[PDB]
A paper describes a structure:
Post-transcriptional exonucleolytic processing of U6 is directed by U6 biogenesis protein 1 (Usb1), a 3′–5′ exonuclease belonging to the 2H phosphodiesterase superfamily of enzymes. The highly conserved U6 snRNA coordinates magnesium ions in the active site that are required for splicing catalysis. We determined the 1.8 Å crystal structure of the catalytic domain of yUsb1, and a 1.4 Å co-crystal structure of hUsb1 bound to the substrate analog uridine 5′-monophosphate (5′ UMP). Here, we have demonstrated that two members of the 2H phosphodiesterase superfamily, yUsb1 and hUsb1, are mechanistically distinct, yet are involved in the same step of U6 biogenesis in their respective organisms.
Residues 107–115 could not be modeled in our structure and are presumed to be disordered. Despite low sequence identity (<20%), the structure of yUsb1 is strikingly homologous to that of human Usb111, with nearly superimposable active sites (root mean square deviation for H/S in active site=0.3 Å). NE2 of H231 is 2.8 Å from the sulfate ion, while H133 is farther away (4 Å). Our crystal structure reveals that residues 73–76 form the start of a β-strand and make several intramolecular contacts that are likely important for folding. In yeast, this position is a phenylalanine (F78) which cannot form an analogous hydrogen bond. Indeed, mutating F78 to alanine causes a slow growth phenotype in vivo and a >300-fold reduction in the rate of processing in vitro. Yeast Usb1 catalyzes two distinct chemical reactions: (1) exonucleolytic removal of a terminal uridine (“first step”) and (2) cyclic phosphodiesterase (CPDase) ring opening to leave a noncyclic phosphate (“second step”).
Numbering used by the authors: 73 to 106, 116 to 290
Write the structure that this text describes.
């Protein structure tokens, strides 16, 4: 019906990292079980698939012109804030995140707040400003909070209304157990050279500098 977008960083994990993400997923599910998860970085034919960090929810633009202004203002905001490439640090301990339409659960890795703070802080006002300029003035609910930034690495197969209802309480229970049970000793990070704004047709890559 409309002209949608959403904004993200992309990660193309190497086979070395695939192996680590697979271990994380297996050990989480071991700890959980005493629901199944499919990896998001492997396709159904067994090929690599990119991961991402979502910086916004879905952005509904009623006109193609408004979405265009958004994308221009993203680029302008990046140029004026002098954004250059940086590495983004990713936590090795996962938790559950609810999908945007709330019927799916993902196993995700937090984008850790403290070591990325200086790198990530500018994007909030850059996005907020591009959103307001393009007609979305109620932007607060659309920009992902720093504490919710994450990379989904698996999708829960076949959840349950009850399990979906109580995912946050499951997170409390599992978070405690993961610290007692599991020892995820991986140094996860990736280079961010650009930011993407999706469109149905194709994803617009906006280079930094």
């Amino acid at each position: 019906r409309f002209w949608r977008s959403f904004t993200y960083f992309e990660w193309r994990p190497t086979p070395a990292i695939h192996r680590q993400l697979q271990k994380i997923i297996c050990k989480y599910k071991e700890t959980f079980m005493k629901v199944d998860f499919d990896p998001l970085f492997i396709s159904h034919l067994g090929a690599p698939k990119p991961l991402h960090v979502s910086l916004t929810r879905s952005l509904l633009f009623e006109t193609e012109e408004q979405r265009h202004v958004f994308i221009q203002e993203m680029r302008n905001g990046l140029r004026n804030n002098e954004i250059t490439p940086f590495k983004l640090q990713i936590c090795s301990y996962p938790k559950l995140y609810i999908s945007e339409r709330a019927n799916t659960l993902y196993l995700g890795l937090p984008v850790s707040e403290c070591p990325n703070k200086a790198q990530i802080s500018p994007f909030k006002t850059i996005i907020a400003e591009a959103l307001q300029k393009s007609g979305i003035s109620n932007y607060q609910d659309l920009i992902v909070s720093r504490q919710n930034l994450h990379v989904s690495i698996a999708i829960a197969s076949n959840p349950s209304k009850a399990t979906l209802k109580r995912y946050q309480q499951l997170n409390e229970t599992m978070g405690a157990l993961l610290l007692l049970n599991n020892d995820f000793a991986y140094k996860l990070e990736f280079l961010v050279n650009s930011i993407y704004c999706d469109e149905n047709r194709h994803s617009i890559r906006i280079p930094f500098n």
